[PDB]
């Protein structure tokens, strides 16, 4: 899904921290 693409940004949250 294309909505899952937005979930990829969530993986950057813990990586951005």
Curated annotation (Swiss-Prot):
Subcellular location: Cell membrane; Membrane raft; Mitochondrion outer membrane; Cell projection, Axon
Induction / repression: Up-regulated by endocannabinoid anandamide.
Disulfide-bonded cysteines: none
Tissue occurrence: Widely expressed, with highest levels in fetal and adult brain. Expression levels of isoform 2 and isoform 3 are much lower than those of isoform 1.
Role: G-protein coupled receptor for endogenous cannabinoids (eCBs), including N-arachidonoylethanolamide (also called anandamide or AEA) and 2-arachidonoylglycerol (2-AG), as well as phytocannabinoids, such as delta(9)-tetrahydrocannabinol (THC). Mediates many cannabinoid-induced effects, acting, among others, on food intake, memory loss, gastrointestinal motility, catalepsy, ambulatory activity, anxiety, chronic pain. Signaling typically involves reduction in cyclic AMP.
Note: High-fat diet also increases the hepatic levels of CNR1 ligand anandamide, but not that of 2-arachidonoylglycerol.
Assembly description: Interacts (via C-terminus) with CNRIP1; this interaction attenuates constitutive, but not agonist-dependent, inhibition of voltage-gated Ca(2+) channels in neurons. Associates with G protein alpha subunits, including G(i) alpha-1/GNAI1, G(i) alpha-3/GNAI3 and G(o)-alpha/GNAO1; palmitoylation is important for interaction with GNAI3 and GNAO1.
Protein name: Cannabinoid receptor 1
Organism from which the protein derives: Homo sapiens
Recorded name of the encoding gene: CNR1
Residues of the full protein shown: 400 to 416 of 472
């Amino acid at each position: 899904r294309s909505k899952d693409l937005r979930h990829a940004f969530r993986s950057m949250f813990p990586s951005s921290e």
